[PDB]
């Protein structure tokens, strides 16, 4: 990716959001038991 921006006399940041699916599946099989399944795609953690 190549961004072209107006010049600024101060340090700045180019903030990029890569749109994906950031999901969780919650399982609660028994009393006082929480199991989770995280899945982030693309860009898996």
């Amino acid at each position: 990716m190549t961004f072209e921006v107006d010049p600024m006399d101060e340090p700045t940041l180019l903030y990029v959001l890569f749109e994906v699916f950031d999901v969780v599946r919650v399982h609660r099989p028994h009393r006082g038991v929480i199991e989770t399944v995280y899945l982030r795609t693309p860009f898996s953690a």
Binding site: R31, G32, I34
Partner: protein, 50 residues
């Protein structure tokens, strides 16, 4: 300031006053910043004691 000279003088009779800039201070919208999020070192916890 008419003079960088201490002590009361006829000179100081010409000094001018101006209100200070307004400055609001408070907690953020939706309490942003209060709780840690997306920080590996200070990760929240929700777990079954079991």
């Amino acid at each position: 300031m008419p003079t960088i000279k201490e002590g009361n003088s006829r000179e100081l009779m010409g000094q001018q006053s101006m209100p200070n800039r307004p400055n609001y201070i408070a907690f953020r919208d939706n309490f942003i910043g209060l709780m840690y999020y997306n920080s590996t070192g200070n990760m929240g916890v929700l777990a079954g004691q079991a």
